[PDB]
Amino acid sequence: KPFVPKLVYFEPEALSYPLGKELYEKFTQMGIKIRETTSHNQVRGIPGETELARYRNAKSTLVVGVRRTLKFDSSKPSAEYAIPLATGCMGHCHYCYLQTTLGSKPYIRVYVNLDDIFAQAQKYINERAPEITRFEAACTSDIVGIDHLTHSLKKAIEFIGATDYGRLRFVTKYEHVDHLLDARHNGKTRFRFSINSRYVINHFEPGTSSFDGRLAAARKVAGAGYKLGFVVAPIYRHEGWERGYFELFQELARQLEGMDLSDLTFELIQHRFTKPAKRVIEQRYPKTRLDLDETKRKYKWGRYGIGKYVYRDEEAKELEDTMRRYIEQFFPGAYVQYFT
Ligand SMILES: C[Se@@+](CC[C@H](N)C(=O)O)C[C@H]1O[C@@H](n2cnc3c(N)ncnc32)[C@H](O)[C@@H]1O
Numbered sequence: 001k002p003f004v005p006k007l008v009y010f011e012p013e014a015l016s017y018p019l020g021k022e023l024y025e026k027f028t029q030m031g032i033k034i035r036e037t038t039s040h041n042q043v044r045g046i047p048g049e050t051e052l053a054r055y056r057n058a059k060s061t062l063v064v065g066v067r068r069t070l071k072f073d074s075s076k077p078s079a080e081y082a083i084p085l086a087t088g089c090m091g092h093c094h095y096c097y098l099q100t101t102l103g104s105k106p107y108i109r110v111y112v113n114l115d116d117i118f119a120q121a122q123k124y125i126n127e128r129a130p131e132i133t134r135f136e137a138a139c140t141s142d143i144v145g146i147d148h149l150t151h152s153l154k155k156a157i158e159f160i161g162a163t164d165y166g167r168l169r170f171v172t173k174y175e176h177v178d179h180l181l182d183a184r185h186n187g188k189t190r191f192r193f194s195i196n197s198r199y200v201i202n203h204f205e206p207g208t209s210s211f212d213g214r215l216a217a218a219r220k221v222a223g224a225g226y227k228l229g230f231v232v233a234p235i236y237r238h239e240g241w242e243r244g245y246f247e248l249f250q251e252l253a254r255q256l257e258g259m260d261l262s263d264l265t266f267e268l269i270q271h272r273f274t275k276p277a278k279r280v281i282e283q284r285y286p287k288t289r290l291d292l293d294e295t296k297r298k299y300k301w302g303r304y305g306i307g308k309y310v311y312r313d314e315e316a317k318e319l320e321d322t323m324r325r326y327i328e329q330f331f332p333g334a335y336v337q338y339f340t
C-alpha cells in the first residue's frame with residue numbers, strides 16, 4: 001500500500017540494463033537487504049523455518065533478472081500473446097491459480113531487458129499485420145500493483161501506443177495507478193480491474209486493494225482516456241451468490257454513474273482449481289473458507305500438462321446466464337467478451 005519489498009535479489013547481468021541499475025541504486029539508498037542470485041528462477045536463502053514462513057517471506061521478496069525466454073506464450077481468450085514484464089504477486093488471494101501453475105514461484109520477479117522484450121513484441125505484431133495483435137501484461141502477475149517501482153508497464157503502454165497494429169491489456173486488484181494516468185496510451189490499452197461479490201473479496205482476497213479503491217482507480221484511468229473493462233473472476237457459488245453478485249453490478253453501476261460506458265467490456269471466469277490445489281492452499285491458508293470439494297465438480301483434462309476442476313455444465317450455464325442478465329440490466333451496451 002503501495003508494495004515495497006523487504007528483500008531484493010539481483011542477477012549480476014541485470015545491472016547492465018537501465019532498470020536494474022536504477023533499482024539497485026533505489027534499494028541501496030532505502031537500506032533494504034540486497035542479495036545476489038545466478039538465475040531469477042533459482043533463488044536461495046529466503047527466510048523461514050516452515051513452508052508457510054518461506055511462502056509469506058517470498059511474497060515480500062523482489063527478484064530482478066533478465067528475460068531469456070523471448071518466446072511469448074499464448075494468453076487466449078484474453079489476448080494473442082502474454083508480454084513478459086513481470087511474474088508473481090504480493091497479494092494473498094486464497095484461490096490464486098498462479099499457486100499451482102507449472103514452474104510458478106511465490107516471489108515477485110521483474111525483467112530489466114525491456115528493449116529485447118518490446119523488440120520481440122514488435123516482431124509478433126509484424127508477423128500478423130495488418131491483423132491486430134493483442135498483448136496481455138498481467139497473465140502471471142499483478143503488473144499494475146508492482147509498476148510504481150519500475151514504470152515498465154508505463155513504457156509498454158507507450159510502446160504499444162506508437163504501433164499501428166498492436167494493442168495492450170491488463171487486469172489488476174490494486175489502486176496504485178497514479179503514475180500511469182499521463183501515459184501516452186493513444187487509445188490502444190484496455191485497463192481492467194478484477195471485481196467480485198463482497199463475500200469473495202472479504203474472505204478470499206487479503207493483501208489487495210478494496211473494492212472502493214479499485215473503483216476509484218477505475219474512474220481515474222477512464223478519466224485519463226484509457227479503455228475501461230472489468231474481469232468478474234473467480235465467479236464462486238458461495239452461500240447467497242445470486243444476491244451477492246446482483247449487488248456487485250448494482251454497486252458497480254452506482255460508482256460509475258455519469259461516465260460514458262459505451263465501450264465498457266466484461267470478462268467472466270468461473271472458479272477453477274487443480275488437483276494439487278487442496279494441499280497447497282490449506283498449507284498456506286489453513287483458516288480459509290474456500291470449498292475445494294472435487295466431487296461436486298466437472299474435470300477438464302489437460303493437454304500437455306494437467307487439467308482443472310470447473311463447475312458442472314448446468315451450474316456453469318446458470319452462472320453465465322445469471323451474470324449476463326445483470327450486465328444487461330445495469331450496463332446496457334456493454335460487451336461481454338467471454339464466459340469460461
Ligand atoms: C491470476 Se490473476 C492476474 C491479474 C491480477 N493479479 C488480478 O488478480 O486481477 C487473472 C484473473 O484470474 C482470476 N483468478 C485467479 N485465480 C483464479 C481461479 N483459481 N479460478 C478462477 N479465476 C481465478 C483473478 O481473480 C483475475 O481476475
Ligand code: SF4
Binds near residue numbers: 090092140173
Ligand atoms: S491479485 Fe491476482 S495474481 Fe495476486 S494473488 Fe490475487 S489473483 Fe493472484
